[PDB]
Design a protein around this ligand. Structure first.
Ligand SMILES: Cc1ncc(C[n+]2c([C@H](O)C3CCC3)sc(CCOP(=O)(O)OP(=O)(O)O)c2C)c(N)n1
Ligand SMILES: Cc1ncc(C[n+]2c([C@H](O)C3CCC3)sc(CCOP(=O)(O)OP(=O)(O)O)c2C)c(N)n1
Ligand SMILES: Nc1ncnc2c1ncn2[C@@H]1O[C@H](COP(=O)(O)OP(=O)(O)O)[C@@H](O)[C@H]1O
Ligand SMILES: Nc1ncnc2c1ncn2[C@@H]1O[C@H](COP(=O)(O)OP(=O)(O)O)[C@@H](O)[C@H]1O
Ligand SMILES: [Mg+2]
Ligand SMILES: [Mg+2]
Lengths: 530, 532
């Protein structure tokens, strides 16, 4: 019994529990749409820009915990998505990008939007920022390739995949071979027992242990065993800026965020070296996460690091025990072994109004810009994984679009995006797609009339010698929401903001809130990095 | 022995190449570059709303400039956004220089903020397949030589884009003043052999039914005058490729229109009938849309001549009898010398008509990708050389939307109009804010048919409408979108509101947008042809 090669790929994608595919169609990429629409199990989402779809697939992935899928046509369709694929690459999230190719009969001829080595070579443009980038050579090889793709995206440190599909093979017949995921993909690695008992032994003798939880806690879905491990051990837990959300910040053992725009209940504990035992679980230990690799973060006795990627272990700090394993399989073993022992408006208040009204289960997406300083510092996130910030690449526009995918992945939970205005101008057009698909998301535009943080570097680094930051005319984001069919609120006092915010969440449809913000307000954590 | 920072010397040499703007968005590590431009007071920076628009602006400026276009973007996502614009510069053979930041060397491999090395997001290797050169500045001293290498590479041979990556720490290291005029580090252009020019001369002399196919290469060589003098001196008719529309006056007696996609029956019949004996191809790559999917009937009976500055294009899809590797302007000047010395809603079809009946003769017309290509290429008549700007090499949606702003910065005292689809404007539509900011009078004509016109036509004409991925449930309102960005706008539901709107647009000398309601089921010209 046969199917068309591209028909078998969606059926294999169905088996991975992929529910939506975001993208923009094209001549050579239509065979895929006729296939997704033949099955009616997976649904296609038409976006306004291919980076917006990629950003959505990434957003769907991180909250879904499943594989994100986006599609694009030959050439510029594909190149458009790149920045989103580059963010999925730096945040360790499994995104599969499907791109079309011209038929082999036109290779080297100057085909329309040719994406081979002879034209715009997608597979090598996309290699440095994917776990795998490959053109399917034959129809017959579609099953084994797409299982190769799904296996690579969600094993090890997860990441994005680029699959290039020549339009001609897309409808060649092939045998129907669809497998459940666990038949062609392995499980995760656990720590050796020798290391589990050595750090158990280091915790038992510690005068001041501390845990630094990074983004790996979310990819490992390790919140519960982290919460049980901290509670059982009594060790205080700090998050990276990107790892905020991975431990409840209301909890007695919570020190908040360590690093950029962080809290100094974390700074002192972790930086004023009383610390002797440091357990780093699922963090790159990059710039922001370490306060520019401050040598004072190193503990006096032992540094322990758990990470599913061996190459990150001991990269910037010498480790005493380096565990190459899943954070969730490591922690349950650790608990198993220790219980076995038995012995305008000021942004500060716009976050303030948000904390007083967003439901407990609100997923908060934050963009890149001064909104990260406000988001990481002043919002307290109590629900596991409910704080969504893309600090891997820190691309402006990320959450503006990301969030749409997040609410498709968690439709019964409220989803809110806190974004800057220049970021909204880069990807704000995708509120039209939420409008078209009736995806109720609330964007909170922190409108300071330009590039907030760049304005501050000018003043504080090149003594107001020039201005490349401010606008001469602020954008009108409520008129813009109106053009895109989205209900809108303007707020220039705190209480207009609160009225807007509780109207939006009642609203059952997309909504945008345009907040007046002074471009000179110095965000938390910006004067320390200067 | 005057010393200056490397980034000042980069700017100073760019000044020598006549670049007048740098399009981009600032960032932490890229701020030294902006500090340099503002202290020098010559080149001016344009802050755009997306870096892809900045690269679109630089491509448009270069194409109208005849000079080098420059954009800048920061580490990581800054540069990746610009990719599609650089890939467009690469497929249309436009000299664009994209300057991108790199974190300081002391943070390589450490996980620095938006690290764009081999250890992070590899800018130099991402940009390698769609640039003539992509290289990270290794040291401060090599800024002079690497910047002179980029200008020579971008504007020599077949022109194309360049990627220069600059580590943020070496930007501010002092280097010796070392600035040269453009003709001390780049060569001139190649001419044909005397042997081949007289061999082509002697073929046209004996040709019964010769024909010329003029492609985009005529604009890159700045060869319009001698192409018209070559056709006039020889009496042989001129057809263009769809992308070369503005290279041969269509109001001339010898003009054949466009041959290929959405072309004219005049051009197809002469070149495909089977009565041509000598065909000269000047500057076209002879790809799909340039040759009706490589119809073998384009082969001439006697001799095919191909002229092209890139040798690897000669005879690629059709066998040539004379293959000249030379610049098109120097070839045409030699052939003329050697023969003279010899001595012996609204229907879009009526929207562009309203446009041609009203727009000045010197208007530079930008067209985006979508049905506007069928309407622009087929129904618009272009009489001015280079006055039609369409990026058909990559055919990236949204290209004309932003590029026209760069075009009008390059030709400030000529009218510039962009004819774009509604989905195209939705991806890069927000750049009009940049035009409102800098007071750049461009007129956008949005053919708003409420979704993806040609894809909807594919559904009907290849999937029998088994599905709809093409129309939006709610047409976007582009006059409200214009208004919120500070741009004057007009809506048109009649043909006359369009004529009133367009005539208002041109008088105002400010940015303006005209939102035209169009039926999405209208079959554009040349779309019937392309279905099989
Ligand atoms: C795609 C992309 N292109 C450029 C940047 C660089 N970049 C910022 C970085 O974080 C570092 C802060 C110095 C560089 S920040 C910021 C202004 C945001 O302006 P807005 O959106 O309005 O936010 P705000 O006004 O609240 O500051 C910009 C442009 C980026 N990150 N991504
Ligand atoms: C960046 C980018 N992403 C996708 C495409 C594919 N694509 C077109 C190509 O040429 C081929 C013709 C079918 C594929 S065309 C068109 C819609 C026009 O929508 P509009 O702007 O409204 O134009 P129109 O209404 O007249 O059809 C689209 C989406 C593209 N080119 N670039
Ligand atoms: N399932 C997992 N278990 C443990 N660690 C993981 C897992 N998945 C990813 N990681 C690790 O988490 C780290 C996340 O680092 P990054 O994405 O830079 O976050 P942060 O900046 O918060 O440290 C990476 O080093 C990655 O190898
Ligand atoms: N200065 C020049 N003189 C002559 N030909 C050129 C010059 N610059 C570029 N070309 C050629 O013009 C061609 C442009 O092709 P393309 O971009 O596909 O336009 P079209 O579709 O009209 O062929 C390329 O083959 C290139 O080698
Ligand atoms: Mg702002
Ligand atoms: Mg349209």
């Amino acid at each position: 019994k046969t199917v068309t090669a591209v028909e078998l790929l969606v059926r294999q994608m169905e088996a991975e529990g992929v529910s939506y595919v975001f993208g923009i169609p094209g001549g050579p990429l239509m065979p895929l749409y006729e296939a997704i629409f033949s099955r009616k199990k997976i649904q296609p989402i038409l976006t306004k820009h291919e980076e917006g779809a990629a950003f959505m697939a990434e957003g769907y992935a991180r909250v879904s915990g499943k594989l994100g899928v986006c599609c694009a046509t030959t050439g510029p369709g594909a190149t458009n998505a790149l920045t989103g694929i580059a963010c999925a690459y730096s945040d360790s999230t499994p995104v599969l990008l499907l791109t079309a190719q011209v038929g082999t009969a036109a290779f080297g001829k100057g085909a329309l939007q040719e994406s081979t080595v002879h034209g715009v070579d997608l597979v090598s443009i996309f290699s440095p920022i994917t776990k795998l980038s490959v053109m399917i050579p034959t129809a017959e090889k579609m099953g084994e390739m797409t299982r190769r793709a799904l296996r690579t995206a969600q094993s090890g440190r997860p990441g994005p995949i680029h699959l290039n599909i020549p339009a001609d093979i897309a409808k060649h017949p092939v045998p129907l071979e669809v497998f459940p995921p666990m038949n062609y993909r392995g499980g995760k690695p656990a720590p050796t027992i020798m290391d589990v008992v050595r750090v158990a032994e280091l915790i038992f003798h510690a005068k001041r242990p501390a845990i630094l939880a990074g983004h790996g806690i979310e990819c490992a879905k390790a919140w519960e065993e982290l919460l049980d491990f901290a509670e059982l051990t009594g060790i205080p837990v700090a998050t990276t800026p990107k790892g905020k959300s991975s431990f409840p910040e209301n909890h007695a053992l919570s020190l908040g965020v360590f690093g950029f725009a962080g809290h100094q209940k974390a700074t002192d504990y972790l930086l004023s070296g009383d610390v002797d035992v440091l357990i780093v679980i699922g963090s790159s230990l990059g710039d922001w996460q370490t306060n520019s690799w401050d040598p004072r973060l190193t503990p006096s006795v032992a540094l322990i690091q758990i990470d599913i990627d061996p190459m990150e272990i001991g990269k910037n700090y010498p480790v005493d025990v380096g565990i190459n394993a899943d954070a969730s399989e490591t922690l349950k073993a650790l608990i198993l072994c220790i219980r076995s022992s038995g012995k305008g408006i000021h942004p500060a208040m716009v976050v303030e109004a948000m904390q007083n009204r967003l439901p407990a289960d609100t997923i908060l997406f934050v963009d890149n810009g001064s909104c990260i300083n406000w988001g990481v510092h002043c919002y307290l996130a109590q629900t596991p994984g409910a704080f969504q910030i893309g600090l891997g690449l820190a691309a402006m526009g990320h959450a503006v679009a990301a969030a749409i995918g997040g609410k498709l992945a968690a439709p019964d939970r409220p989803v809110v995006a806190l974004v800057g205005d220049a970021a909204f101008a880069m990807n704000g057009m995708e509120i039209h797609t939420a409008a078209e698909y009736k995806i109720p998301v609330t964007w909170i535009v922190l409108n300071n009339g330009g590039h907030g943080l760049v304005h501050l570097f000018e003043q504080h680094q090149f003594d107001s010698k020039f201005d490349i930051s401010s606008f001469r005319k602020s954008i009108d984001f409520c008129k813009m929401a109106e053009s895109l069919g989205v209900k809108s609120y303007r707020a220039e006092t705190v209480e207009d903001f609160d009225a807007a915010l509780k109207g939006a969440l009642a609203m059952n449809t997309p909504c945008l809130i345009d907040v007046q913000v002074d471009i000179d307000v110095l965000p938390p954590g910006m004067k320390q990095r200067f």
